[PDB]
Amino acid sequence: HMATVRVQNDDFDLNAEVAALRARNPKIGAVACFVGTVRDLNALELEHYPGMTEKALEKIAAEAGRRWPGIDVAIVHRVGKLYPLDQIVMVATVAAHRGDAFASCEFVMDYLKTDAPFWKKETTPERWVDARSTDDAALARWGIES
Amino acid sequence: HHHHHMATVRVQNDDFDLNAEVAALRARNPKIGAVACFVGTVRDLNEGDAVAALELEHYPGMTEKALEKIAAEAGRRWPGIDVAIVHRVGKLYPLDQIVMVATVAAHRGDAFASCEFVMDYLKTDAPFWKKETERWVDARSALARW
16 A cells, blocks of 8 residues: 555644554554644745645655655645644654654655645745755755755 | 642553644644654554453652653753653553653754654653563663664
8 A cells, every 4th residue: 555645725633644544554553743833933825736746745655665664654734824823734654663653754754845846925026935945954864965 | 629730741541632632732832833743552463352462550650750851851952842741551452552752842853853762761761560471570671872
């Protein structure tokens, strides 16, 4: 089975997503997850490229599966207008052992934040700008340079 | 009459609710929004639930104090995070939740790092015992990463 990846406007339910991830993998029980929320410092509006963004998230998830055989991965990323304290994205992984669960979850989040094509609204007389991270050393921990 | 508060680091027999603990953790940290979680469940090896797959007991007082010591050390190493720990005791069956750790930080790197640190030291240092037939044996466990 392939990793679960979707982009949606509606909010997600972390328990429900973790439960579904677990139900696909009954013989392993180490689950690591990450939930990012809109930080409340004094709004965010995101869009994706339908198809292209999902395919990139699926490539990232498949690369995690190549590095840590036996894991499973779930990714749910929201788009649209997101307000302070709103959930933005969740990543959950399950593995036999916690080490692989933590590593794969953080790898997926790092790669998603660097490479998954998203755009964010920016208002200047308003436009859509690249939301990918500009940190050209983020993936160096994972053996990926430049 | 006055109600004592439920601890953010605790041991209990009852099951816990991951999203409820994450929601409360976020409500105690209104200005930061990167949440990392670990949840461990009992592996399903098709043994059935007629007999406990895992049976744990703790040292009342000492175990909680040890977990609070771990969480406080995490707060020293990653200033600005917050930590929640719920560990179950008693008879646990295949697919049951065992333990969760959740951390919140301004940035995902500190959230992941503190969550892994807490889980690593919990597994090595928190006083727990597990039944093995029958006797109660030390459940404590390579922390060189830290």
